[PDB]
Ligand binder design. Structure first.
Ligand code: CA
Lengths: 48, 44
């Protein structure tokens, strides 16, 4: 590991936590603003 | 929205610089319930 992957671990935890405080339209609106390329990298990493 | 957008961008930038063993070792440390929430959110 590294301090960068420790950072990544905390970003993931923060993102799940923030998602809990969002309403449906806010979560969809957030996802709508994320480039599909960024989403794809995250999906495949989580599904690997 | 701005903070979460930055979180997602920073995360993508970190993952793209990682070797395969680093990315997969990091995935090992993510709870399955967290991974499932994020996957379903990203795929809709
Ligand atoms: Ca499910």
């Amino acid at each position: 590991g590294s301090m960068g992957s420790l950072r990544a671990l905390h970003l993931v935890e923060d993102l799940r936590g923030l998602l809990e405080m969002m309403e449906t339209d806010e979560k969809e609106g957030l996802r709508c603003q994320i480039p599909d390329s960024t989403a794809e990298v995250l999906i495949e990493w989580l599904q690997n």
